[PDB]
Design a binder for this molecule. Structure first.
Ligand SMILES: [Mg+2]
Length: 64
RNA sequence: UUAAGUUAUUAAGGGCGCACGGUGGAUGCCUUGGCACUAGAAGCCGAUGAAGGACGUUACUAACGACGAUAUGCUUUGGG
């Protein structure tokens, strides 16, 4: 996903970070009520956040 | 039949021998871990916050290992 993330702009990555965190939080609430049934989405969204934070961190270090 | 003698039988339990079981973990075989060394490298890190820890991180989860709110992991370069 990193190659696709690198095509996004800086404002887009922040928006992706916010939206991914909302999705993960929604998954956690569904899991706590026994409604999820798709538990592999949790790990997938968590790693997407990790990739998104990595690309943002690289750009700031690179520019600085 | 009497009289006078003699000597068995019984095993409540026990003894010796044998047979078959149990308990127990010796012995044999085995090695996951140790012990003594050889050769080469290296030895000591820390306010750019150490050594050592606490608490957390997996869909479910107690403990250990790995990891640190990017958490049972992220990127990249090579290997496969
Ligand atoms: Mg008897």
């Amino acid at each position: 996903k990193a190659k696709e993330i690198r095509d996004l702009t800086t404002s887009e990555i922040e928006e992706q970070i916010k939206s991914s965190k909302e999705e993960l939080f929604n998954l956690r609430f569904q899991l706590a009520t026994g409604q999820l049934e798709e538990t592999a989405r949790i790990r997938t969204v968590r790693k997407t956040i990790a990739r998104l934070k990595t690309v943002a961190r690289e750009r700031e270090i690179e520019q600085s």
